[PDB]
Amino acid sequence: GQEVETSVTYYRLEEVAKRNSLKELWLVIHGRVYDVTRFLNEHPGGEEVLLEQAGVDASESFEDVGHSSDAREMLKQYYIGDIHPSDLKP
């Protein structure tokens, strides 16, 4: 009856996919979930390039843009949890 200790909060992709609009947008980048709602209208690349990646892996999109170190550091403020292990590639 020993129990695994919990640490990070996991979200399944099907739950992430429900926050898919200007009301509330979560994005998945490198295995982590970011609630970027508050940043949508500040994002230099605009809202639409973020919105269109709802519910899918946004990592390739994010990396192809060539985001600066400053942009990468801004990521952490929007962190809310990790994608559930069952939704990752092995």
Binding residues for heme: 43, 67
For ligand HEM, give the closer residue by CB, 3 or 64. 64
85 binds a copy of itself (CB under 8 A): no
Question: Considering the complex, what minimum distance in angstroms separates the CB of residue 1 from a copy of itself?
Answer: 27
Among all chains, which residue has been given the structure tokens 């992430």? 16
> Which segment (4-12, 44-52, 62-70, 75-83) binds Mg ion by CB under 5 A?
44-52
- Strand 10-11 relative to strand 79-83, pairing: parallel
Nearest to 27 by CA among 64, 85, 78: 78
Which residue from 13, 17, 40, 51 is in contact with Mg ion, where contact means CB under 5 A?
51
> Residue 70 belongs to what H/E stretch?
helix 69-75
Q: List the single partner that 6 binds among a copy of itself, ligand HEM, Mg ion, none, CB under 5 to 8 Å by kind.
A: none
Alpha carbon distance 47, 41 (integer Å): 6
